[PDB]
Amino acid sequence: SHHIRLLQQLDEQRQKDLFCDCHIIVEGQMFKAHRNVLFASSGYFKMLLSQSCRDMGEPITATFDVFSADTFTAILDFVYSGKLPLSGQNVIEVMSAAAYLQMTDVIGVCKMFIKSSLDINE
Amino acid sequence: SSHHIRLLQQLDEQRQKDLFCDCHIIVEGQMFKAHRNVLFASSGYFKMLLSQSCRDMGEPITATFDVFSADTFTAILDFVYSGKLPLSGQNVIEVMSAAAYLQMTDVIGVCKMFIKSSLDINE
Numbered sequence A: 001s002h003h004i005r006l007l008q009q010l011d012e013q014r015q016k017d018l019f020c021d022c023h024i025i026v027e028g029q030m031f032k033a034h035r036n037v038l039f040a041s042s043g044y045f046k047m048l049l050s051q052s053c054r055d056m057g058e059p060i061t062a063t064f065d066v067f068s069a070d071t072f073t074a075i076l077d078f079v080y081s082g083k084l085p086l087s088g089q090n091v092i093e094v095m096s097a098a099a100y101l102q103m104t105d106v107i108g109v110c111k112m113f114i115k116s117s118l119d120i121n122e
Numbered sequence B: 001s002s003h004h005i006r007l008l009q010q011l012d013e014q015r016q017k018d019l020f021c022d023c024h025i026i027v028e029g030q031m032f033k034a035h036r037n038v039l040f041a042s043s044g045y046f047k048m049l050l051s052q053s054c055r056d057m058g059e060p061i062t063a064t065f066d067v068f069s070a071d072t073f074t075a076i077l078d079f080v081y082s083g084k085l086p087l088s089g090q091n092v093i094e095v096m097s098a099a100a101y102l103q104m105t106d107v108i109g110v111c112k113m114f115i116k117s118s119l120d121i122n123e
Helices: A002-014 A035-041 A043-051 A069-079 A091-100 A104-115 B002-015 B036-042 B044-052 B070-080 B092-101 B105-116
Strands: A022-026 A029-033 A060-064 B023-027 B030-034 B061-065
Touching (some): A035 A043, A091 A104, B023 B070, B030 B070, B044 B061, B070 B092
Parallel strands (some): A022 A060
Antiparallel strands (some): B023 B030
């Protein structure tokens, strides 16, 4: 019970630019978040922010041109909530984006949604 | 529930290795490193102390305390990063006083429950 309350509070902080030391530019749209949470939830951020993990200065700004801004929004909301909105339109882009970010848990849910659908060759 | 537990088990490991620790807390000499964004979400006192310097990404903020013991603050800080508080007759008073000073309503309720599980009469 205590764990859920803490994460519901962290999501409110990043949506108000509270202690946000990590900006993420995906197709122009900016995403503010906490650098200590991405390190714990993504292998990519665990490696990018590893070097500058004790340099308390200007906020670290990551950039991405491999996925869309809307695709990254669903994943970023999952990081601060644990709920991923999947559908036939986004299941592919979310899977590609999750692998780039090195999040094994998201990849598994995408494969389960793929198993619940049919895709054949033309 | 699994994602929440894993994240908190990861955050507790970070503060014990000085990873992204921008908040130092000096309680009776012993220093405690932690994340201010988690203390802001779990304590009303820190929600007010860090309110002014909430967007000033600079040197780490250093708080001081002389109202409770270092061991009392250690048990509470371990509760923040785990959600499990070990209460007993020896520490229920110090934890309750420290929890109120830190403005954590949840900790006070568990202390009051342990008080109901104990006996206190006059001398």
